[PDB]
Design an enzyme around this catalytic site. Structure first.
Site, PDB file in Angstrom:
ATOM      1  N   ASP A 183       0.985  -1.100  -0.181  1.00  0.00           N
ATOM      2  CA  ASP A 183      -0.018   0.182   0.018  1.00  0.00           C
ATOM      3  C   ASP A 183       0.871   1.142  -0.225  1.00  0.00           C
ATOM      4  OD1 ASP A 183      -2.404  -1.110  -0.189  1.00  0.00           O
ATOM      5  OD2 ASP A 183      -3.343  -0.019   1.816  1.00  0.00           O
TER       6      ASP A 183
ATOM      7  N   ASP B  47      -7.574  38.900 -32.737  1.00  0.00           N
ATOM      8  CA  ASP B  47      -6.754  37.317 -32.860  1.00  0.00           C
ATOM      9  C   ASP B  47      -8.106  36.018 -31.646  1.00  0.00           C
ATOM     10  OD1 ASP B  47      -5.145  35.792 -34.912  1.00  0.00           O
ATOM     11  OD2 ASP B  47      -4.536  35.472 -32.862  1.00  0.00           O
TER      12      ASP B  47
ATOM     13  N   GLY C 162      -5.215  23.499 -33.580  1.00  0.00           N
ATOM     14  CA  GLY C 162      -5.921  23.206 -34.283  1.00  0.00           C
ATOM     15  C   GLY C 162      -6.182  24.219 -35.374  1.00  0.00           C
ATOM     16  N   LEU C 163      -6.736  25.019 -35.171  1.00  0.00           N
ATOM     17  CA  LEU C 163      -6.010  26.134 -36.438  1.00  0.00           C
ATOM     18  C   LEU C 163      -5.126  26.318 -37.165  1.00  0.00           C
ATOM     19  CD1 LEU C 163      -8.510  28.581 -37.391  1.00  0.00           C
ATOM     20  CD2 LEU C 163      -7.258  29.854 -35.898  1.00  0.00           C
TER      21      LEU C 163
HETATM   22  S1  SF4 Z   1      -3.783  -5.633  -3.341  1.00  0.00           S
HETATM   23 FE1  SF4 Z   1      -4.813  -4.123  -3.181  1.00  0.00          FE
HETATM   24  S2  SF4 Z   1      -5.231  -3.287  -0.980  1.00  0.00           S
HETATM   25 FE2  SF4 Z   1      -3.580  -5.103  -0.860  1.00  0.00          FE
HETATM   26  S3  SF4 Z   1      -2.043  -4.295  -0.994  1.00  0.00           S
HETATM   27 FE3  SF4 Z   1      -2.245  -4.153  -3.156  1.00  0.00          FE
HETATM   28  S4  SF4 Z   1      -3.386  -2.390  -3.762  1.00  0.00           S
HETATM   29 FE4  SF4 Z   1      -3.623  -2.186  -1.460  1.00  0.00          FE
END
Ligand code: SF4
Ligand code: SF4
Ligand SMILES: [Cu+2]
Ligand SMILES: [Cu+2]
EC number: 1.3.7.7
Lengths: 419, 403, 419, 404
Positions: free
Chosen positions: C36, C274, C409-410
């Site tokens: 995480d 312009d 774009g123009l």
């Molecule tokens: S599976 Fe999902 S919740 Fe678990 S560490 Fe990976 S991103 Fe985080």
């Protein structure tokens, strides 16, 4: 004779018109054929000026030839004085007016106008726009700038910024903030934001700062000789160049070298892992010599780019251009033909092209990442946002502007790979 | 009347002519001023490798007339070697080329002699000393006219250079009407050059082809004097005047032009909402000002205050001047300072001016619309009548929105 | 179980993490599974931050459950105190730790660490990252900000700016310049420039300036109740909103308005000929509600665009979003799903799209000019150059950024016709 | 050391897996955190409409395995309604899914009962509490293995997801060896899936595939341990082990392989200009660190001060560790503060660490390379040996000599 489709520089009177437009209270009564009013659109459109260029045209025709041309010029100058009430008059000739034998300065003197009248002798067929601007600024200084007692506090002159200049407006502000951070006040900025009164006080500055040699070297040298004003030889484009400019300006002024690096992010953002792919990217550089030398130093020292191309269209700065190019191990491409630049790019195949709008259009048809660093530009290239090329904020702007084409190319390439 | 004339040399019309004639190159014998004008007016066109270039004169070229002619000959040879697709070379004059007395007629004859018939070298002047803006197109067409082959047929000549979609609409509407042959003098290729004879009858599309009108009249052609095809009524009267010369009756005309007229009127009404009841000021740029002020006054409901043109050709603008209301005053003399003073005094709701005068007038508080767009953009005939109205409407719409 | 590929907002712990990395001396000890720590990459690369985010993770595995996982939490907070030595510790849990039955607050009290410890109970599945940042800032203010004596001179709090925020740094600088020009100093900038000491001093400011409601409105409404500090209801994006902000700030402070217009360029470069083609161009808008509401006013009242699509992914601001869109004759698209905004763009077929990064990619697939105006961005959308979106210089940056796609774009269309 | 670990959960393995398996869609049953991680590590791929989605667990999804499984079936059916091109579905386990104890193995069986001939639903766990980074890839492969059909022919077998150019050049060199038809387990489509039997001896191209190695051993296939194709020497010994197992003559093998070995040596020498006599540090990112250190130390001349691996499979990496010098310090387990102090003390000239750690160490003055690029960019075999060398040649240390 040579068939030219694109000119990096206009005729000298366009540069003189730039000097007149940047200055206030200064009028250019130009002896021009009917239909040479065209360069007013450059200032009104490209720079978005809310005031018409302070230039009076005789606009003579076939009927007004011979004896009528001189009378037309004299009436044009006197009527311009009556209408616009300028504090000083420039008188000049176009290519057509140079071809015909009217003596513009003689007529202007014969009118005996109350305000100083500046005679402009710009050889139109052998010289170009930057010579026109430089010589016009010269003659204005000679006519109006005189030895003057220096300011009690340390003061500086910003010399070089002319109208229709690449990011001159924001560079003025950045250099002004730099000098104020040092403790050095800007006595006068010329030609932009200047008046004949300010040209009179140009002798009150302790030293000169030559931001743009292309349009101010002659004036800086003249001030050195007559007004006893040394001028900076360092253009503060890029972190290294900005710091050298800081040291040189502090030495000239006598104040301790002080610069604000707090908002400077270019060094860290080039040292970051995201910028690692920039190492060794071959770059072609073209445009005005000052900008090309500064950008080559920035690229090599601060960007990790290897400079494989370097050139300028100002033959007036060929020797500095070649001298700078020898430092990178290449021969400078000093040419005014866009075909030669295209040939050099094709034979060189740069990974990134930094240059003019012509070089920004050669890259597109070759599919090369491109960015604009030099004077020939479009209305789009003049920004509403604060976009300096000088100082530390200018260094950040340079980083973002130069990396944007490469980042775009990499992102589109990844998108194509992922389908 | 005489003073600073904020107009363009006729070297500007070269930009349109190279777009409309794909086999034509426009070599400009001028200085760096004229090359800089060409690139500035072209804008993006120069980056697409257009078919116009400037042979910039040097001091040795001014000094030596024979040397200049020889160098021009070498340049033309190199041009034709470089671009074999060119079939007609246009040696255009310029202000310096006139002052040096560089006779481009002799050069044109010589190069036509040596490079004939693969490339035809015509000579016309775009010098601002002589011409102005659209007078470059007029000079190019008037230089084309004398070399046209003679014909004994009754052919209609659609004189004027038009956008391809507008020209296609023109020929489609005419063929639906029931006319005979239709040819355009600014032909796409040299092989498609029309023939002019005593029976040839021509119709002007743009209100600045006076010298072309004279050159065609010298050859025996007859002018279909009609209001110029601007807006629903303008196109209607143009086609009606051509029909009266071709025998097309009211029944077939109303069976052909009823649908485009009906839709064009609705388009103009929808695209001219803010224009109605507003004054419009015209400054002399392109000689389109009277024939288009008629459209603005009659269709869009605008109240023209002053119509300024570089010079009136009352002969070819006679019907369109007749359709003008007596209210607007018309000026042919251009002094930009006096005209700007007149604009300030009038305080117009819209001000059709040049590109150089546009932004300062906007900063002073006057809505403006550059007339250069009118020449570049397709604003002719029926489909683009709504576009023509919207060109003048959008500055007023923006001014209302932004405040 | 809705199949999600793009989320406009991260988990609330990510927003709390933005609050933590904004401040100095505040460490986020997150109860999170191993893996995480991906959001550290967001701060180190997206924002290009020199230092590691002040986030300490437990990184538990399957072998560590029950007593063990609590023990790893204790060890993580204690280790943070010992080696990171922050002035305040804030403890939270991820989705996985939210499921497992470990009380984040109780163990922190069990440690009895001398530094103040705030516990943020953020519903991971109910709420999202903007709520995470808002509630984290609110909890930090509740624990550390206390009523105090008002400052001698008038001072304001810039409430809302966090790390990973869109243009938050340059907007901080621009609004600071605008207030110093107005005579109001900035008491604190929280939480991007704040600290537990600065959060303590938050109560000293005369009034708060809610720069970003998305992250600062909870703290503003709490400081309007506990510290008696009114907050500005207008966000200064664009010229008109900048004048409204100046007026409200003058009214709250009691000082004269004193708006610095001298560097303003958006009005003229929009009124110039312009920009005539800009009239009637249809714009689609999506992103966080504050930026979309401000950008719609900028696009309509200041750039001549017609707004055909107006929406936000931030459902917390559903009433303000709908109320704003009702003024444009539209129904606000309040959706968190990017396929819905894709359908809206395809149905409307706008000429310009102003939104987040997914909005930009949708436009690029659809070939519509696009500029980024909202929070979800890339590393490339964090410039080194000064790029405020707020204030008067922010107006110039807005004009340039929104006009660049249309200009490109123009120009491409013109080149395609020409060649 | 059990502390904070700065490594990715194995859902990141999905990001480069779906580029090799164009028939497979990976459905992640996870929270908002897992979807956010997946999109953040994908970058532009999520804008390119890729083949991984996250069935986000809602609050009502948390309670009730039957209800959540019913909604999972709804979403899967809806997805095959949108996507009839894909035949493989991976119900990738995630950390919240494991905590819920939501049985995804059962779900794979039920969906195979529903639309088995139409779609083959596999199942593995990329959860962080279970799996780290490329362990996601090897878990997916090991999940694929048991369903694979049995074969009775001895064929050369290749394990590991590789770019198509790298796979093509690998099978090309194996064919110029002359003996042993090749086959890759992560097949682009389930139709061309390989047959795995006791006779098919398998060679592993990437070190971290330990679960896949075990699963192939359950099938009866034995592993030929060899140093992995990183650089000229590692690729050479990999191909030499393969040839020896298939009885290719030594002189023939040397003759056929001499040219690409020479090109790879020239390229690694040219790239390793600033790499000689340099110190390199490895943080645990991708389990490629042992072979990385071998390649750098031997071919590039870069002494390794510490090799950090999140999981060191000693049995498979044995030949590579034998090739590695005694000097490098192999370390197992990751405590981010301990390893940060270690790199601070060692003062390495290059640090191959994570992206959340790369920029901070550059700020402190340490040159850093991020190993997450390595699994993305082709860094295997001779034709990419020069690029692999240059990737460590200029991750700064060519920019440091340019910035400073
Ligand atoms: S599976 Fe999902 S919740 Fe678990 S560490 Fe990976 S991103 Fe985080
Ligand atoms: S007015 Fe004469 S000199 Fe000027 S650009 Fe036109 S042709 Fe050239
Ligand atoms: Cu671009
Ligand atoms: Cu772009």
């Amino acid at each position: 004779m040579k068939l030219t489709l694109w000119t990096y520089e206009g005729p000298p009177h366009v540069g003189a018109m730039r000097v007149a437009t940047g200055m206030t209270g200064m009028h250019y009564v130009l002896h021009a054929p009917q239909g040479d009013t065209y360069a007013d659109l450059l200032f009104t459109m490209i720079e978005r000026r809310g005031k018409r260029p302070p230039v009076s045209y005789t606009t003579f025709q076939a009927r007004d030839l011979g004896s009528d041309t001189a009378e037309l010029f004299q009436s044009a100058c006197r009527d311009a004085y009556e209408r616009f009430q300028p504090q000083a008059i420039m008188v000049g000739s176009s290519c057509t007016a140079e071809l015909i034998q009217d003596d513009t300065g003689g007529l202007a003197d014969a009118l005996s106008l109350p305000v100083p009248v500046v005679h402009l002798e710009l050889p139109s067929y052998q010289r170009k726009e930057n010579f026109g601007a430089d010589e016009s600024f010269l003659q204005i200084c000679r006519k109006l700038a005189r030895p003057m007692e220096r300011t009690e506090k340390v003061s500086c002159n910003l010399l070089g910024p002319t109208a229709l200049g690449f990011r001159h407006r924001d560079d003025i502000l950045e250099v002004t903030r730099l000098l104020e951070g040092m403790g050095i006040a800007v006595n006068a900025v010329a030609p932009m934001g200047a008046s004949p009164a300010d040209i009179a006080r140009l002798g009150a500055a302790h030293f000169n700062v030559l931001l743009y040699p292309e349009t101010g070297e002659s004036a800086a040298r003249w001030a050195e000789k007559t007004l006893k004003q040394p001028y900076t030889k360092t253009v503060p484009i890029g972190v290294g160049a900005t710091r050298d400019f800081v040291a040189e300006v502090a030495a000239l002024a006598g104040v301790a070298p002080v610069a604000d690096d707090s908002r400077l992010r270019q060094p860290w953002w080039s040292a970051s892992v995201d910028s690692t792919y920039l190492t060794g990217k071959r770059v072609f550089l073209f445009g005005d010599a000052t900008h090309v030398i500064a950008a080559a130093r920035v690229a090599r020292d601060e960007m990790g780019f290897e400079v494989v191309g370097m050139g300028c269209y100002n033959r007036e700065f060929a020797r500095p251009m070649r001298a700078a190019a020898k430092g990178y191990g290449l021969e400078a491409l000093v040419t005014d033909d866009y075909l030669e630049v295209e040939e050099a790019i094709q034979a060189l195949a740069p990974e990134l092209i930094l240059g003019t709008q012509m070089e920004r259009h050669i890259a597109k048809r070759l599919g090369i990442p491109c960015a604009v660093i030099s004077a020939p530009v479009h209305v789009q290239d003049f920004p509403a946002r604060y976009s300096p090329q000088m100082g530390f904020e200018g260094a950040n702007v340079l980083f973002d502007t130069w990396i944007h084409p490469l980042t775009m190319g990499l992102e589109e390439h990844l998108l194509t790979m992922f389908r | 009347e005489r003073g600073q004339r904020e107009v363009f040399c006729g070297l500007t019309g070269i930009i349109w002519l190279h777009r409309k004639m794909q086999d034509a190159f426009f070599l400009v014998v001028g200085s760096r001023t004229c090359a800089h004008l060409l690139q500035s007016a072209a804008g993006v066109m120069i980056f697409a490798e257009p078919r116009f270039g400037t042979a910039v004169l040097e001091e040795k070229d001014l000094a030596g007339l024979a040397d200049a002619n020889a160098e021009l000959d070498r340049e033309v040879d190199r041009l034709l070697a470089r671009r074999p697709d060119i079939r007609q070379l246009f040696l255009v004059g310029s202000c310096p080329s006139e002052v040096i007395k560089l006779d481009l007629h002799r050069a044109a004859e010589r190069l036509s002699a040596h490079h004939g018939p693969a490339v035809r070298v015509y000579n016309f002047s775009g010098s601002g000393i002589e011409t102005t803006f659209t007078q470059g197109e007029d000079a190019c067409l008037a230089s084309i006219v004398p070399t046209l082959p003679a014909t004994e047929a009754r052919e209609l000549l659609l004189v004027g250079a038009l956008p391809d979609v507008v020209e296609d609409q023109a020929v489609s509407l005419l063929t639906q009407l029931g006319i005979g042959p239709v040819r355009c003098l600014p032909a796409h290729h040299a092989a498609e050059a029309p023939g002019v004879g005593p029976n040839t009858v021509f119709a002007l599309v743009q209100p600045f082809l006076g010298d072309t009108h004279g050159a065609l009249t010298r050859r025996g052609a007859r002018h279909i004097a009609a209001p110029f095809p601007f807006g629903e009524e303008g196109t209607t009267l143009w086609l009606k005047a051509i029909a009266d010369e071709f025998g097309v009756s009211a029944e077939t005309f109303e069976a052909v032009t009823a649908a485009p007229r009906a839709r064009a009127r609705k388009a103009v009404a929808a695209a001219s909402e803010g224009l109605r009841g507003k004054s419009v000021f015209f400054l002399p740029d392109s000689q389109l000002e009277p024939s288009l002020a008629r459209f603005l006054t009659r269709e869009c409901g605008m109240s023209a205050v002053e119509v300024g043109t570089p010079f009136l050709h009352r002969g070819i603008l006679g019907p369109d001047l007749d359709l003008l209301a007596e209210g607007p005053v018309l000026s042919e003399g251009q002094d930009v300072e006096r005209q700007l003073d007149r604009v300030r005094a009038a305080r117009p709701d819209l001000t059709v001016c040049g590109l150089g005068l546009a932004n300062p007038l906007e900063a002073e508080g006057f809505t403006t619309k550059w007339a250069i767009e009118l020449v570049f953009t397709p604003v002719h005939f029926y489909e683009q009548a709504g576009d023509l109205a919207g060109l003048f409407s959008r500055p007023v719409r923006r001014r209302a929105i932004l405040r």
